[PDB]
Amino acid sequence: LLVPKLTASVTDGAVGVTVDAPVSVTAADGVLAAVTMVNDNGRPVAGRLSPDGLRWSTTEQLGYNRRYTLNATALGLGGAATRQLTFQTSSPAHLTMPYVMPGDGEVVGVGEPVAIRFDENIADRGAAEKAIKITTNPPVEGAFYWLNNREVRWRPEHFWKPGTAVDVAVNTYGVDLGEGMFGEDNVQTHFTIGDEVIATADDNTKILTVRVNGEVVKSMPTSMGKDSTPTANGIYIVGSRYKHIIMDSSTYGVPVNSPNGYRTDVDWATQISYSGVFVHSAPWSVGAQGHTNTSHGCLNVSPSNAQWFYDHVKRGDIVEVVNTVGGTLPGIDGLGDWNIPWDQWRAGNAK
Ligand SMILES: [Cl-]
């Protein structure tokens, strides 16, 4: 008596079908006998019928700018039912690829934010945020905030609890990110939070003290930025580490041969700001370390102490600078995320 009815996730003649989800067909008042899908060059598209015969779905990634033809047939006590559908998928103007930090499988400090950097400007930040799923164990609240037009960050209100597992899924393939920009591919990554490592550089004492889970493990005399080019106060996130690097002021916009310029080859350099602040070996300022500031901003320490820092501090650990004559590190520096107040971070800037 009842005839089968066929329902698809697309309609005949549709355009702009997005490829961020499989295409599916479902039968009612009956079961699907067979479903086929082919592309505009005639090639079959891989699919699977559910065991109960009621639901069919594509099983392989669908492509941008293709035309697909779907043919389904179902059987019921009333009789048979058949339909054909043709539709076209999104045709992007541009592609953008996301790049996620930290690396897959890494162990990082309690200050490490999730970073998703696209290689193009993102017109629809809301769509980007919606395609990124952050899972945490233990679960903890967090929020997105854009540092510039290409890079978005995600972090909780306070530093991570040690031992937290973090899973990141950037599912932008098939997502319209605005102005015809679509994701080139998806990215999946996982990382773990390690020990709590907080080094405090106190200008009042000119000592850099490293505390691991509350325990003082190292005290390093330091020479920070001189009065005319002081080290900014605030919370710094540890980034990359270098056995040696040539610090070049022109990288930060200051000509080398200008009054505040510098080019210096140094050892055991740990970067803590995009603005150019490093902890590094400074044999020339050992006597000043612990007494007077002499740098253009870097935390100068002894060779042995700089190497200790390199060996025992990891990406995402924290350096806090206090009591300098400087201002405060900008929240959008690149490693200054924690200087943005939570109320402002949580409200976000997706526009
Ligand atoms: Cl083909």
Numbering used by the authors: 57 to 407
Sentences from the paper on this structure:
The essential l,d-transpeptidase of Mycobacterium tuberculosis (LdtMt2) catalyses the formation of 3→3 cross-links in cell wall peptidoglycan and is a target for development of antituberculosis therapeutics. Whereas the d,d-transpeptidases catalyse the formation of 4→3 cross-links between peptidoglycan pentapeptide chains, the functionally related l,d-transpeptidases (Ldts) catalyse the formation of 3→3 cross-links between tetrapeptide chains. The Ldts, which do not manifest structural homology with the PBPs and likely originate from a different evolutionary precursor, share a common YkuD fold (named after the first identified member of this class), distinguished by a β-sandwich with two mixed β-sheets and one helix, and a set of four loops. The established substrate for LdtMt2 is the disaccharide tetrapeptide monomer 1 (GlcNAc-MurNAc-l-Ala-d-iGluNH2-m-DAPNH2-d-Ala).
Notably, however, when LdtMt2 and 3 were co-crystallised using a precipitation solution at pH 7.0, we observed additional electron density extending from the sidechain of the nucleophilic residue Cys354. The results are in agreement with formation of the dipeptide (d-iGluNH2-m-DAPNH2), covalently linked to LdtMt2 via a thioester with Cys354, apparently reflecting a key intermediate of the transpeptidase reaction with the donor peptide. In the LdtMt2-3 complex structure, the m-DAPNH2 residue sidechain protrudes into the outer cavity, while the d-iGluNH2 sidechain is located in the inner cavity, suggesting that the donor substrate enters from the inner cavity. Note that no electron density was observed corresponding to the l-Ala residue of 3, which has previously been suggested not to play a significant role in substrate binding. Additional electron density at the entrance of the outer cavity was observed, in which d-Ala, released during the formation of the thioester intermediate, could be modelled. The overall fold of the LdtMt2-3 complex strongly resembles that observed for unmodified LdtMt2 (PDB 6RLG27; main chain RMSD 0.65 Å). Notably, no conformational changes relative to unmodified LdtMt2 are observed in loop II, which encloses the active site (residues 300-323) and which has previously been observed to undergo conformational changes upon binding of various LdtMt2 inhibitors, and which has been proposed to undergo extensive conformational changes upon substrate binding. The thioester acyl group is located in the proposed oxyanion hole (the backbone NH groups of His352, Gly353 and Cys354) at respective distances of 3.8 Å, 3.3 Å and 2.3 Å, suggesting that, at least in the crystal structure obtained, no strong interactions are made with the backbone NH groups of His352. Polar interactions of m-DAPNH2 with His336 (3.0 Å), Asn356 (3.4 Å) and Thr320 (2.8 Å), as well as water-mediated polar interactions with His352 (3.3 Å to water, 3.4 Å to His352) are observed.
